[PDB]
Amino acid sequence: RSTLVHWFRKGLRLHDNPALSHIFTAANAAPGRYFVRPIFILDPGILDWMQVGANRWRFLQQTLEDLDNQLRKLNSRLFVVRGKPAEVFPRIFKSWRVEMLTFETDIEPYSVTRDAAVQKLAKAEGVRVETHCSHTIYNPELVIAKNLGKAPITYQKFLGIVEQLKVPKVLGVPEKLKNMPTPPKDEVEQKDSAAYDCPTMKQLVKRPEELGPNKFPGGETEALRRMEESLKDEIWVARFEKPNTAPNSLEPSTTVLSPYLKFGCLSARLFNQKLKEIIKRQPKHSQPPVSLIGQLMWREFYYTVAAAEPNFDRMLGNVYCMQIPWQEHPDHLEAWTHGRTGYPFIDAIMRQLRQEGWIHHLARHAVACFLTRGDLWISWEEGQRVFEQLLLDQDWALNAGNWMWLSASAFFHQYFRVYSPVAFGKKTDPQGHYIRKYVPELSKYPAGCIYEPWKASLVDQRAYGCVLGTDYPHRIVKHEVVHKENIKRMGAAYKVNREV
Ligand SMILES: Cc1cc2nc3c(=O)[nH]c(=O)nc-3n(C[C@H](O)[C@H](O)[C@H](O)COP(=O)(O)OP(=O)(O)OC[C@H]3O[C@@H](n4cnc5c(N)ncnc54)[C@H](O)[C@@H]3O)c2cc1C
């Protein structure tokens, strides 16, 4: 008796999962011949390649527990294997007598390298490998091909390409396993009956004092619930216009399905299909790029450009990216990282990010502009690394692609438009409720200067219980000075890149 193995990496869901579906149907169409090991590998190597904060560790822990729970309802379970794939797969290929291995493809360079070696091993031991592109709606390879070998570098050209492509069939959950015995314990399982159990919170989250509020629980189950909750107001959905959603409402102004889409707890193909059903129903609706389907197409767009550039997450060696002489300033980077810039709107956002792991798109705009071309003139690579640690939805292609946009390094070139750290939040939160919540030490400043506490006299600062420089920091830079200097630095950068 040989084993069929589905390998979870992303695609942490039962629904719309062709690679996992196939394994299951094969076991049921040939009962008695197969064991089934759905596995997730706790790869220590990924830590040398990306930062993971406490909040995202908890989201992953919750996700694996849910996935194990969902698999048990199918007379299976999740087998979480600790170790490096390059060392894990040669062992289990033999100890399990693996016939077929399926997984969902991923375009990240670490994923490509790792998968190539696993496919070299699988070819050596005579193991059949079947891969499926189900993490995105469109296959970046096919988009690039249809555009004659280059990724479209504008959103509109990208849309024109994928409109001519076939939308995939969205699958349901696999059928329950018919008369399947629990596989026999292997070398590892026998010395430890729990060697493959889902990891507890205590095993994955080493810095539990950095956990914030538990607001967006991991798991396919929670992802499906949150999608359904979001789709209930078909009018909000159909008339959604991303630029008009607020960055600083106390409740999120968008869906917050991003962590679920990042891990594959929600199939983007399923989400796309549910959106298209509502739009069909609702003749007055928005269109890309501002619509909700337009937001899914932003995700596809960045995945497509990223798939063609292994150096997508850095400035050097990146075919898309303007070469800009970003400066080093550790103290400023530390202030921005910990929301101690002295600009309450910026600080409020960075503290929400650290505590909760999610901030609104335009809140990302505000803090990214401030760090890079706007104010601090610090490389977008540094902001990307901080976002990578703190975000639940940390996504190699999205995190990089949007930082390049926000810094005027690629895709976006109107660097003369600069967000004010004082004025931008006022449009949607003139009372400063957001600042009061995440910068509580300012909670007694009136609206007239909560965005600019340095315009309150010392007497008033003592009256509000928050003296600048003691209880809340002074501005680390003067926006009105540096943003004009940085515009000229950008123009000089753009001239140098144009001549080369
Ligand atoms: C500096 C910066 C860094 C970012 N880093 C990430 C990241 O690490 N991970 C991430 O998923 N998104 C990232 N984004 C894009 C965007 O901010 C988030 O996708 C969005 O805030 C998620 O909230 P939501 O789920 O409510 O989005 P909604 O408005 O509800 O959109 C639904 C889905 O569409 C996609 N989407 C929406 N906006 C964008 C966008 N601009 N680009 C690409 N896909 C988009 C996401 O899958 C999202 O879950 C970043 C943007 C900026 C400016």
Tab-separated table of N, CA and C in Angstrom, residues 315-416:
chain	number	residue	atom	x	y	z
A	315	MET	N	15.794	46.819	-4.639
A	315	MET	CA	16.079	47.830	-5.647
A	315	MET	C	17.141	47.341	-6.625
A	316	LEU	N	18.241	46.803	-6.104
A	316	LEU	CA	19.352	46.396	-6.954
A	316	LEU	C	19.010	45.129	-7.730
A	317	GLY	N	19.275	45.152	-9.035
A	317	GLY	CA	19.030	44.010	-9.893
A	317	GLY	C	17.591	43.810	-10.303
A	318	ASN	N	16.736	44.808	-10.098
A	318	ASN	CA	15.297	44.687	-10.295
A	318	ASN	C	14.942	45.466	-11.558
A	319	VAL	N	14.486	44.753	-12.589
A	319	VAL	CA	14.310	45.370	-13.903
A	319	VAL	C	13.284	46.496	-13.863
A	320	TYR	N	12.336	46.440	-12.930
A	320	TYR	CA	11.264	47.424	-12.894
A	320	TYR	C	11.648	48.694	-12.151
A	321	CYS	N	12.611	48.610	-11.239
A	321	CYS	CA	12.728	49.549	-10.133
A	321	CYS	C	13.700	50.675	-10.460
A	322	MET	N	13.245	51.909	-10.257
A	322	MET	CA	14.115	53.069	-10.360
A	322	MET	C	15.226	52.972	-9.321
A	323	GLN	N	16.456	53.258	-9.741
A	323	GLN	CA	17.587	53.307	-8.817
A	323	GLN	C	17.635	54.680	-8.157
A	324	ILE	N	17.392	54.724	-6.858
A	324	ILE	CA	17.252	55.966	-6.111
A	324	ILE	C	18.201	55.915	-4.922
A	325	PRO	N	19.024	56.935	-4.709
A	325	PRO	CA	20.006	56.962	-3.606
A	325	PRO	C	19.352	57.233	-2.257
A	326	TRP	N	18.608	56.240	-1.775
A	326	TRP	CA	18.053	56.304	-0.434
A	326	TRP	C	19.182	56.445	0.578
A	327	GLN	N	18.903	57.158	1.658
A	327	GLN	CA	19.916	57.414	2.669
A	327	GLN	C	19.747	56.500	3.870
A	328	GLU	N	20.815	56.388	4.636
A	328	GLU	CA	20.767	55.697	5.908
A	328	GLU	C	20.522	56.637	7.062
A	329	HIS	N	19.472	56.343	7.824
A	329	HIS	CA	19.209	57.041	9.072
A	329	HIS	C	18.597	56.060	10.058
A	330	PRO	N	19.430	55.386	10.856
A	330	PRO	CA	18.889	54.405	11.818
A	330	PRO	C	17.887	55.002	12.792
A	331	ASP	N	18.219	56.136	13.411
A	331	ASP	CA	17.323	56.713	14.408
A	331	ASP	C	15.951	57.021	13.814
A	332	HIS	N	15.912	57.604	12.610
A	332	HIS	CA	14.622	57.872	11.977
A	332	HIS	C	13.881	56.579	11.662
A	333	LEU	N	14.586	55.573	11.137
A	333	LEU	CA	13.927	54.305	10.841
A	333	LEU	C	13.347	53.689	12.105
A	334	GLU	N	14.075	53.788	13.219
A	334	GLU	CA	13.571	53.250	14.476
A	334	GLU	C	12.323	53.997	14.929
A	335	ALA	N	12.304	55.319	14.752
A	335	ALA	CA	11.141	56.105	15.152
A	335	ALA	C	9.918	55.728	14.328
A	336	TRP	N	10.083	55.655	13.007
A	336	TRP	CA	8.990	55.251	12.132
A	336	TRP	C	8.524	53.835	12.448
A	337	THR	N	9.468	52.932	12.720
A	337	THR	CA	9.118	51.536	12.956
A	337	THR	C	8.252	51.387	14.198
A	338	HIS	N	8.522	52.182	15.230
A	338	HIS	CA	7.813	52.068	16.492
A	338	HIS	C	6.778	53.170	16.672
A	339	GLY	N	6.417	53.857	15.589
A	339	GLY	CA	5.434	54.921	15.648
A	339	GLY	C	5.779	55.968	16.683
A	340	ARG	N	7.009	56.462	16.633
A	340	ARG	CA	7.464	57.558	17.474
A	340	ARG	C	8.024	58.682	16.610
A	341	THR	N	7.315	58.998	15.525
A	341	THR	CA	7.755	60.035	14.600
A	341	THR	C	7.404	61.439	15.071
A	342	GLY	N	6.502	61.570	16.041
A	342	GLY	CA	5.977	62.865	16.412
A	342	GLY	C	4.832	63.353	15.554
A	343	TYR	N	4.463	62.611	14.508
A	343	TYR	CA	3.313	62.949	13.686
A	343	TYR	C	2.174	62.015	14.063
A	344	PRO	N	1.158	62.487	14.791
A	344	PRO	CA	0.179	61.557	15.379
A	344	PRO	C	-0.516	60.646	14.378
A	345	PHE	N	-0.828	61.130	13.174
A	345	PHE	CA	-1.487	60.272	12.196
A	345	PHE	C	-0.580	59.115	11.799
A	346	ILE	N	0.677	59.420	11.468
A	346	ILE	CA	1.645	58.375	11.149
A	346	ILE	C	1.826	57.429	12.326
A	347	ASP	N	1.963	57.977	13.534
A	347	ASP	CA	2.232	57.124	14.685
A	347	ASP	C	1.036	56.234	14.991
A	348	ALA	N	-0.173	56.783	14.865
A	348	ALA	CA	-1.376	55.988	15.068
A	348	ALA	C	-1.400	54.781	14.143
A	349	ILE	N	-1.040	54.975	12.872
A	349	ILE	CA	-1.096	53.872	11.917
A	349	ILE	C	-0.073	52.804	12.276
A	350	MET	N	1.161	53.219	12.557
A	350	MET	CA	2.203	52.237	12.821
A	350	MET	C	1.929	51.468	14.103
A	351	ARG	N	1.251	52.092	15.068
A	351	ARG	CA	0.894	51.374	16.285
A	351	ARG	C	-0.272	50.418	16.050
A	352	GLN	N	-1.269	50.820	15.255
A	352	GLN	CA	-2.293	49.849	14.873
A	352	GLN	C	-1.667	48.660	14.161
A	353	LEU	N	-0.712	48.925	13.267
A	353	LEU	CA	-0.049	47.850	12.535
A	353	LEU	C	0.646	46.884	13.487
A	354	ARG	N	1.459	47.414	14.400
A	354	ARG	CA	2.194	46.550	15.316
A	354	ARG	C	1.245	45.754	16.205
A	355	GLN	N	0.179	46.393	16.687
A	355	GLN	CA	-0.703	45.737	17.647
A	355	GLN	C	-1.648	44.746	16.978
A	356	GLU	N	-2.149	45.073	15.786
A	356	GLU	CA	-3.248	44.323	15.197
A	356	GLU	C	-2.889	43.584	13.915
A	357	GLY	N	-1.790	43.942	13.260
A	357	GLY	CA	-1.354	43.225	12.080
A	357	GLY	C	-2.088	43.577	10.810
A	358	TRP	N	-2.960	44.580	10.844
A	358	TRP	CA	-3.630	45.025	9.634
A	358	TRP	C	-3.902	46.517	9.728
A	359	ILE	N	-3.643	47.222	8.627
A	359	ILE	CA	-4.023	48.619	8.479
A	359	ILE	C	-4.581	48.809	7.077
A	360	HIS	N	-5.416	49.833	6.937
A	360	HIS	CA	-6.104	50.091	5.681
A	360	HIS	C	-5.110	50.451	4.576
A	361	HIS	N	-5.518	50.188	3.332
A	361	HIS	CA	-4.672	50.463	2.174
A	361	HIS	C	-4.095	51.874	2.197
A	362	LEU	N	-4.944	52.884	2.386
A	362	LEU	CA	-4.450	54.254	2.361
A	362	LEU	C	-3.695	54.628	3.630
A	363	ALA	N	-3.907	53.901	4.730
A	363	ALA	CA	-3.010	54.035	5.870
A	363	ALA	C	-1.622	53.512	5.527
A	364	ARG	N	-1.553	52.446	4.727
A	364	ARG	CA	-0.270	51.995	4.205
A	364	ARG	C	0.361	53.068	3.324
A	365	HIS	N	-0.439	53.671	2.441
A	365	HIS	CA	0.040	54.790	1.637
A	365	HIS	C	0.678	55.867	2.505
A	366	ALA	N	-0.049	56.322	3.530
A	366	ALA	CA	0.447	57.401	4.376
A	366	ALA	C	1.821	57.076	4.951
A	367	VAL	N	1.959	55.913	5.591
A	367	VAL	CA	3.207	55.624	6.289
A	367	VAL	C	4.317	55.265	5.309
A	368	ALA	N	3.976	54.665	4.166
A	368	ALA	CA	5.000	54.324	3.182
A	368	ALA	C	5.551	55.575	2.506
A	369	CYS	N	4.674	56.512	2.156
A	369	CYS	CA	5.128	57.775	1.591
A	369	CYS	C	6.025	58.516	2.574
A	370	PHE	N	5.606	58.576	3.840
A	370	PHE	CA	6.401	59.244	4.865
A	370	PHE	C	7.804	58.655	4.953
A	371	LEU	N	7.917	57.325	4.913
A	371	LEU	CA	9.216	56.689	5.103
A	371	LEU	C	10.143	56.934	3.919
A	372	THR	N	9.596	56.957	2.708
A	372	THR	CA	10.426	56.963	1.511
A	372	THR	C	10.499	58.353	0.892
A	373	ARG	N	9.868	58.531	-0.269
A	373	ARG	CA	9.995	59.784	-1.001
A	373	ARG	C	9.402	60.965	-0.245
A	374	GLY	N	8.486	60.714	0.692
A	374	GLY	CA	7.777	61.813	1.326
A	374	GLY	C	8.634	62.591	2.310
A	375	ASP	N	9.228	61.897	3.282
A	375	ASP	CA	9.803	62.615	4.413
A	375	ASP	C	11.172	62.098	4.845
A	376	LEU	N	11.286	60.806	5.143
A	376	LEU	CA	12.516	60.295	5.734
A	376	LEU	C	13.578	59.927	4.711
A	377	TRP	N	13.195	59.702	3.454
A	377	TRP	CA	14.134	59.314	2.398
A	377	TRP	C	14.864	58.023	2.760
A	378	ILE	N	14.133	57.095	3.363
A	378	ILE	CA	14.641	55.773	3.704
A	378	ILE	C	14.135	54.784	2.666
A	379	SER	N	14.994	53.843	2.278
A	379	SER	CA	14.636	52.888	1.239
A	379	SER	C	13.304	52.215	1.542
A	380	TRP	N	12.535	51.955	0.482
A	380	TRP	CA	11.320	51.165	0.626
A	380	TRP	C	11.622	49.751	1.106
A	381	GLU	N	12.844	49.261	0.876
A	381	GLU	CA	13.215	47.935	1.358
A	381	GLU	C	13.109	47.845	2.870
A	382	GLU	N	13.394	48.946	3.569
A	382	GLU	CA	13.305	48.938	5.022
A	382	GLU	C	11.853	48.915	5.478
A	383	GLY	N	10.995	49.693	4.817
A	383	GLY	CA	9.575	49.627	5.121
A	383	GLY	C	8.991	48.264	4.811
A	384	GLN	N	9.408	47.671	3.692
A	384	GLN	CA	8.955	46.328	3.347
A	384	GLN	C	9.297	45.330	4.447
A	385	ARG	N	10.497	45.438	5.019
A	385	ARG	CA	10.909	44.498	6.058
A	385	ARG	C	10.065	44.661	7.315
A	386	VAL	N	9.726	45.901	7.670
A	386	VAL	CA	8.878	46.131	8.835
A	386	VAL	C	7.462	45.638	8.562
A	387	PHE	N	6.921	45.961	7.385
A	387	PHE	CA	5.623	45.421	6.998
A	387	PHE	C	5.640	43.901	7.005
A	388	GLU	N	6.745	43.309	6.558
A	388	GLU	CA	6.841	41.858	6.490
A	388	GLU	C	6.719	41.230	7.873
A	389	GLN	N	7.317	41.866	8.882
A	389	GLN	CA	7.244	41.354	10.246
A	389	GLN	C	5.839	41.470	10.818
A	390	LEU	N	5.187	42.609	10.598
A	390	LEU	CA	4.039	43.010	11.396
A	390	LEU	C	2.701	42.661	10.766
A	391	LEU	N	2.666	42.386	9.470
A	391	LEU	CA	1.407	42.193	8.773
A	391	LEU	C	0.928	40.756	8.914
A	392	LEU	N	-0.387	40.600	9.053
A	392	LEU	CA	-1.005	39.290	8.884
A	392	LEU	C	-1.003	38.876	7.420
A	393	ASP	N	-1.191	39.834	6.525
A	393	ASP	CA	-1.328	39.568	5.103
A	393	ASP	C	-0.020	39.695	4.339
A	394	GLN	N	1.112	39.781	5.046
A	394	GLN	CA	2.432	39.836	4.428
A	394	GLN	C	2.467	38.999	3.162
A	395	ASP	N	2.699	39.632	2.016
A	395	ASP	CA	2.708	38.909	0.752
A	395	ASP	C	3.876	39.405	-0.083
A	396	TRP	N	4.797	38.492	-0.403
A	396	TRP	CA	6.043	38.871	-1.062
A	396	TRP	C	5.786	39.820	-2.226
A	397	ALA	N	4.861	39.450	-3.117
A	397	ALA	CA	4.641	40.243	-4.322
A	397	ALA	C	3.888	41.534	-4.020
A	398	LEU	N	2.882	41.472	-3.148
A	398	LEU	CA	2.090	42.663	-2.855
A	398	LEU	C	2.891	43.661	-2.024
A	399	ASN	N	3.538	43.182	-0.961
A	399	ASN	CA	4.373	44.037	-0.119
A	399	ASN	C	5.439	44.755	-0.943
A	400	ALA	N	6.131	44.020	-1.813
A	400	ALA	CA	7.147	44.648	-2.653
A	400	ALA	C	6.515	45.574	-3.687
A	401	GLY	N	5.538	45.070	-4.441
A	401	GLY	CA	4.977	45.854	-5.531
A	401	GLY	C	4.396	47.180	-5.077
A	402	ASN	N	3.680	47.181	-3.950
A	402	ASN	CA	3.067	48.419	-3.483
A	402	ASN	C	4.087	49.380	-2.896
A	403	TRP	N	5.145	48.860	-2.270
A	403	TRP	CA	6.206	49.738	-1.791
A	403	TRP	C	6.900	50.434	-2.953
A	404	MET	N	7.109	49.713	-4.055
A	404	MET	CA	7.680	50.333	-5.241
A	404	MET	C	6.748	51.399	-5.804
A	405	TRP	N	5.442	51.128	-5.809
A	405	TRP	CA	4.470	52.145	-6.202
A	405	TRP	C	4.543	53.358	-5.282
A	406	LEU	N	4.524	53.127	-3.972
A	406	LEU	CA	4.380	54.244	-3.045
A	406	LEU	C	5.622	55.124	-3.025
A	407	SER	N	6.780	54.554	-3.338
A	407	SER	CA	8.041	55.280	-3.341
A	407	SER	C	8.370	55.877	-4.701
A	408	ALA	N	7.475	55.740	-5.680
A	408	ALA	CA	7.711	56.224	-7.038
A	408	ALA	C	8.908	55.527	-7.673
A	409	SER	N	9.160	54.285	-7.267
A	409	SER	CA	10.232	53.484	-7.832
A	409	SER	C	9.799	52.708	-9.070
A	410	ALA	N	8.501	52.446	-9.219
A	410	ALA	CA	7.973	51.739	-10.378
A	410	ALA	C	6.462	51.915	-10.413
A	411	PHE	N	5.894	51.760	-11.613
A	411	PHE	CA	4.445	51.723	-11.791
A	411	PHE	C	3.792	53.083	-11.570
A	412	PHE	N	4.310	53.852	-10.617
A	412	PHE	CA	3.782	55.163	-10.265
A	412	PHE	C	4.925	56.162	-10.323
A	413	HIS	N	4.714	57.281	-11.022
A	413	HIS	CA	5.803	58.214	-11.287
A	413	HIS	C	5.458	59.672	-10.997
A	414	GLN	N	4.282	59.960	-10.438
A	414	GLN	CA	3.913	61.341	-10.114
A	414	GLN	C	4.348	61.696	-8.690
A	415	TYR	N	5.662	61.611	-8.469
A	415	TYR	CA	6.213	61.833	-7.140
A	415	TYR	C	5.958	63.240	-6.615
A	416	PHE	N	5.531	64.181	-7.462
A	416	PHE	CA	5.258	65.520	-6.949
A	416	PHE	C	3.988	65.566	-6.111
